[PDB]
Design a protein around this ligand. Structure first.
Ligand SMILES: [Mg+2]
Ligand SMILES: [Mg+2]
Ligand SMILES: [Mg+2]
Ligand SMILES: [Mg+2]
Ligand SMILES: [Mg+2]
Ligand SMILES: [Mg+2]
Ligand SMILES: [Mg+2]
Lengths: 52, 110, 95, 287, 24, 54, 54, 152
RNA sequence: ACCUCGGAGCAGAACCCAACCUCCGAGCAGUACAUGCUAAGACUUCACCAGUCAAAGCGAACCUCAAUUGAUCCA
């Protein structure tokens, strides 16, 4: 049903998190907080390591 | 260990004072240690018992006991429960009383 | 824990206690909550923060960890850059 | 006193009236009779009486407390860390006032061991004795001291009266040599040379603000003036003092002593010191 | 000494419109 | 008078301006009995107040 | 207020500060069961490494 | 007497004098930002034992010769709450239990105050936590003005 | 016949209490990732391992349901 993916940031590489996503949809491009920048940058879905 | 040199100001820093010369006509006497320090230490038995022990007591122990009792009476309001040990020169006093006894023995003449 | 060995006849320790705990000179053992690095996607951030805290042990646990060790692990170390140096001595204690 | 007056009489004190102090010798308990009999203080039957008990920590199949907790880098490499015994300026002033530390000679490690102010253990991974600025106020000594680790406040307080702080490093062999030199002389081996500091201590021992023994002497007055401007007080000049030649004892490295030299065999019996000759030995000892 | 220096270490205020004016 | 400003007695207060025998609207013909004094609130104190009692 | 206290009362200007009571902390036990590492810093006097006989 | 390859003189040939490490550079470090200690009155009137020491230092700001006129006027205007009745600048600190650390903190405070009083083009950080209500009250007090003439 | 957990009466008005006593279920979900970082004080399934609420600050525009789950080692 669902799937767990990891989002990689565009600015300040090194900080990534995990979030749920549907399996029959496309990728994700949300706005997540980055502690090294203290602002809001873009995150791209990359490399899935879970199939729940 | 050599004897400490005679300083110019006897109020020598870091808390140290040498005993004077023919000290006073008292029935009891308090000696020194190897490092020329005042024999006033602390001791604990279990985890809550607190007392101080004067390990160098020579002379009449009852006189020194009465003196320290009269000295600590206004500081506590009651009678300090002490142990008059005669076989050894010890005098246990219940409660944390280290610097006070040190200052009293330094100002008395020991 | 082998109270008497066959060569030296001394007391042996458990290396798991040393690798999983940290004894302070005051008499406290610093441990770590289990499960602080596994399955972090279904836990609230409050639980994630609570699991990442140096939690102290109890009385029987500290006594067991002391009995499992010898007199070498109950000394006082003076490291140059010890982040737990201020936790060795415990002040303001009234029975 | 009254003790001798009471001991003047009474029979003699021989091996017939040896009375131990009450409270020290407790009677031995024997599990025989009715009070300590029947089960001999073992309770009911089972593993508590047969003696076949599991080891300390086993909870009967249940996972113990010291196992369910994962491992963490608490004591990873404790057997390789550098430990330094503390040393406050208050205790130093106390030792100087008592006379165990004479402020007329340069103080290093052997002087502190002879004065018995600090206990330097050759083992347990100890690379010397550090310095503590706990006794900053009411500190009037004015004497050079060689400390392995000295903080900024301690160096400033020492330089206020007119002291010299020398930061040096020594290998554990040099520590064992400088702690007890009498067994080192009774050993029969020549005096080795000092070892260079490790890779993680070169910028610390070659810095000017740390008063290292390998830094250039051209940046010391600048650091002293900076410390005087920071912590206040007018910085006095030691070039006009009568003990100028005593404070200039910077202790050249590859010596691990003072007035001797590496490779000089010291013999206690028959006060004679032998000098190594040849050229290879001198080239190795002066390298 | 000046007799007008009677300040006392503790000073009270008898105004209800005071604590909310200082955001306290 | 100032309800808040007395440093000594907490229940009491100070006096600033006081007049007497004012011929109706003539507030400049009556006799004087207390010189005017501007308020002097403390630094760390709160918000003082002064009321005009007529 | 400074000029008033200077050239009108012949005294010094008193200062104050809105102080607050200290925070409440329970009695420090010997074995703090299930407490963070910062439990010892709650009862610590000064945040500096103190040294006794050393 | 003894010297090896790693000696102090061989590693630094330019520094070989016997007093090159003790020569006080007083002739090349006597600027106006040194703060003279002879005109400062530093006193300690607290010995707590909450172990914290107090180091109070005061000096007549109106008679300071090491400070220029405009910077002195600016630091007296912007810091008119710490000036005593006799023109004494009372500055104290309560951080560490040692007197040396408190004295160094007071010196650093004096230095930063001096270096910020001279720099007039300073961008003020707009805060909104305690001055907003003050500005609102000032605007509301200024708004209620609609007469024609008043002197005094 | 069952192996974990929650609810309804036994257990009635602070709390705890079992049965091979009688019934509903759960191994998830419909929408934004500040579902960021620190830090006083408490409850705690009758021990421990575990779980939960939150003062305040820096940072930002002005979270719903009842159980809803997995530790040591290792990779
Ligand atoms: Mg004892
Ligand atoms: Mg039987
Ligand atoms: Mg049985
Ligand atoms: Mg068996
Ligand atoms: Mg099992
Ligand atoms: Mg409980
Ligand atoms: Mg909040």
């Amino acid at each position: 049903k669902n799937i767990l993916v990891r989002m990689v940031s565009e600015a300040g590489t090194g900080f990534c998190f995990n979030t749920k996503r549907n399996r029959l949809r496309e990728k994700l491009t949300l706005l997540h907080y980055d502690p090294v920048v203290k602002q809001r940058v873009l995150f791209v879905e990359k490399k899935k390591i879970r199939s729940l | 260990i050599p004897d400490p040199p005679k300083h110019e100001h006897y109020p020598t820093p870091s808390g140290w004072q040498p005993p004077r010369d023919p000290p006073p006509n008292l029935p009891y006497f308090v000696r020194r240690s190897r490092m020329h320090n005042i024999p006033v230490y602390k001791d604990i038995t279990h985890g809550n018992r607190q007392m101080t022990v004067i390990r160098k007591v020579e002379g009449d122990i009852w006189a020194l006991q009465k003196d320290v009792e009269d000295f600590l009476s206004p500081l506590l309001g009651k009678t300090p429960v002490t142990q008059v040990n005669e076989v050894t020169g010890t005098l246990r006093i219940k409660g944390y009383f280290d610097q006070e006894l040190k200052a009293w023995l330094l100002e008395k003449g020991f | 824990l082998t109270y008497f060995s066959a060569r030296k006849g001394k007391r042996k320790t458990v290396k798991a206690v040393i690798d999983r705990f940290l004894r302070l000179h005051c008499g406290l053992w610093v441990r770590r909550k289990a499960g602080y690095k596994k399955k972090l996607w279904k836990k609230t951030p409050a639980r994630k923060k609570r699991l990442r805290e140096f939690v102290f042990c109890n009385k029987t646990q500290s006594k067991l960890l002391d009995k499992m060790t010898t007199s070498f692990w109950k000394r006082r170390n003076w490291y140059v850059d010890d982040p737990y140096q201020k936790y060795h001595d415990r002040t303001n204690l009234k029975v | 006193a009254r003790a001798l007056d009471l001991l003047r009489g009474l029979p003699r004190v021989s091996l017939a009236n040896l009375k131990p102090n009450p409270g020290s010798k407790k009677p031995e308990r024997r599990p025989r009779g009715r009070r300590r009999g029947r089960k001999c203080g073992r309770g009911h039957k089972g593993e508590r009486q047969r003696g076949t008990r599991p080891r300390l920590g086993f909870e009967g199949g249940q996972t113990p407390f010291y196992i369910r907790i994962p491992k963490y880098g608490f004591n990873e490499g404790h057997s390789f860390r550098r430990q330094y015994k503390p040393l406050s300026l208050n205790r130093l002033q106390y030792l100087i006032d008592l006379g165990r530390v004479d402020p007329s000679q340069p103080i290093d490690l052997t002087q502190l061991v002879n004065g018995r102010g600090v206990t330097i253990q050759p083992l347990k991974r100890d690379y010397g004795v550090q310095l503590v600025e706990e006794g900053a106020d009411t500190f009037t000594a004015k004497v050079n001291i060689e400390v392995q680790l000295a903080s900024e406040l301690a160096i400033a307080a020492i330089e206020k009266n007119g002291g010299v702080v020398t930061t040096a490093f020594y290998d554990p062999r040099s520590l064992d040599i400088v702690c007890k030199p009498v067994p080192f002389f009774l050993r029969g081996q020549p005096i080795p040379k000092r070892m260079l500091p490790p890779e993680e201590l070169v910028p610390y021992y070659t810095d000017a603000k740390n008063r290292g023994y390998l830094a250039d002497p051209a940046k010391f007055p600048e650091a002293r003036l900076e410390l005087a401007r920071k912590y206040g007080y007018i910085l006095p000049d030691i070039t006009k003092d009568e003990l100028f030649k005593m404070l200039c004892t910077r202790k050249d490295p590859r010596q691990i002593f003072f007035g001797l030299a590496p490779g000089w065999v010291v013999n206690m019996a028959d006060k004679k010191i032998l000098k190594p000759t040849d050229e290879n030995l001198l080239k190795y000892y002066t390298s | 000494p000046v007799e007008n220096e009677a300040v006392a270490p503790e000073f009270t205020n008898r105004n209800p419109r005071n604590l909310e004016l200082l955001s306290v | 008078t100032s309800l808040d400003g007395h440093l000594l007695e907490p229940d009491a207060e100070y006096l600033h301006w006081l007049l007497t025998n004012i011929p109706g609207n003539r507030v400049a013909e009556g006799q004087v009995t207390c010189p005017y004094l501007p308020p002097f609130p403390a630094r760390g104190s709160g918000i003082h107040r002064l009321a005009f009692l007529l | 207020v400074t000029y008033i206290f200077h050239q009108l009362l012949d005294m010094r200007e008193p200062v104050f500060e809105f102080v607050r009571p200290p925070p409440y902390h329970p009695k420090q036990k010997r074995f703090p069961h299930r407490q963070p590492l910062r439990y010892l810093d709650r009862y610590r006097d000064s945040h500096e490494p103190t040294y006794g006989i050393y | 007497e003894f010297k090896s390859i790693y000696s102090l003189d061989k590693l630094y040939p330019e520094s070989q004098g016997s007093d090159t490490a003790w020569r006080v550079p007083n002739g090349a470090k006597q600027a106006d930002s040194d703060i003279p200690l002879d005109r400062l009155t530093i006193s300690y009137c607290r010995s707590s034992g909450k172990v914290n020491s107090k180091a109070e230092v005061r000096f007549h700001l109106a008679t300071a010769e090491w400070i220029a006129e405009p910077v002195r006027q600016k630091i007296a205007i912007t810091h008119k709450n710490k000036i005593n009745r006799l023109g004494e600048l009372i500055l104290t600190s309560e951080s560490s239990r040692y007197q040396f650390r408190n004295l160094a903190d007071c010196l650093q405070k004096i230095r930063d105050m001096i270096t910020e009083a001279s720099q007039t083009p300073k961008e003020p950080t707009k805060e909104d936590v305690k001055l907003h209500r003050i500005r609102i009250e000032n605007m509301n007090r200024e708004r209620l003005r609609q007469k024609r003439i008043h002197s005094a």
